[PDB]
């Protein structure tokens, strides 16, 4: 541990193009493992990791029926929120939810998540006490009052402390081996000439998993160059990730700069420099 189980929900109205797009995506430890999409040829919860293929038909039928119920509920709620905000009909709007649990290595709940957004802005969330709500505005206050009157927090807390934690335990047991996998980055430095006898040194990390990584450039043991260019970590398309970091240095000084690559897969951080052919 720690481990987490979270569902990311998206409902997008599209007047004139039929009923709203509706999707639910589940993650175990930030790895997608199940997905439902109303725009699939056959909308149904489907496994998104091979280890989920060990769940029998009852599981998929049950989860699919919940998704279909949630879909109908969010269809209503899109209309409701239009009313709360006195918005005109005919536009496309979005409700999103992040729902789930994080548990410690000892199996105890560390935190619960129930966060809503409307049109990409926070709307309502369950507080850390698992008992009260934070509403973002006067519209969300209406939902908050409905939920207080219905005892929704108590129902949700039962899910977060019970079902969510227990199913996470189940998923981890099936997916343990696969979830633990790491791929170490492979690194190299490239050299590019710039005007005024300057040089771009670019330190690449490729083929790594999971995405968390740190690249740094050092002159003389510092671990310290403030002004690098970095790109955001990006998916290679094969389940691994890429990143690079560059610095501009004077021609004739390239050999004094060192790139370090830090990743959980590595026995020790990588250290490399520009290797003149």
């Amino acid at each position: 541990g720690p481990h987490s189980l979270r569902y990311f929900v998206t409902a997008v109205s599209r007047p004139g193009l039929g009923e709203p797009r509706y999707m639910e995506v589940g993650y175990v430890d930030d790895t997608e493992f199940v997905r439902f999409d109303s725009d699939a040829e056959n909308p149904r919860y489907e496994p998104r990791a091979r280890w989920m293929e060990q769940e029998g038909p009852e599981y998929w039928e049950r989860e699919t029926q919940k998704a279909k119920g949630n879909e109908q509920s969010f269809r209503v709620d899109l209309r409701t929120l239009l009313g709360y905000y006195n918005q005109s009909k005919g536009g496309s709007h979005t409700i999103q939810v992040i729902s789930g649990c994080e548990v410690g290595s000892d199996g105890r709940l560390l935190r619960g998540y129930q966060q809503y957004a409307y049109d990409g802005r926070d709307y309502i969330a369950l507080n850390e006490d698992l008992k009260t709500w934070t509403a973002a505005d006067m519209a969300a206050l209406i939902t908050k009052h409905k939920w207080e009157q219905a005892g929704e927090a108590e129902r949700l807390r039962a899910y977060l402390e019970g079902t969510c934690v227990e199913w996470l335990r189940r998923y981890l047991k099936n997916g343990n081996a696969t979830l633990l996998r790491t791929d170490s980055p492979k690194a190299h430095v490239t050299h590019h000439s710039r005007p005024e006898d300057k040089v771009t040194l670019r330190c690449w990390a490729l083929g790594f998993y999971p995405a968390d990584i740190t690249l740094t450039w050092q002159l003389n043991g510092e671990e310290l160059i403030q002004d690098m260019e970095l790109v955001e970590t990006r998916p290679a398309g094969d389940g691994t990730f890429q990143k690079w970091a560059s610095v501009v240095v004077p021609l004739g000084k390239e050999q004094y700069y060192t790139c370090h690559v830090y990743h959980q897969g590595l026995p020790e951080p990588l250290t490399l420099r520009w290797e003149p052919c």
Binding site: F74, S99, Y116, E152
Partner: peptide, 8 residues
């Protein structure tokens, strides 16, 4: 297992 979400 997903939650059954509440009416807003």
């Amino acid at each position: 297992a997903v939650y059954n979400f509440a009416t807003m």
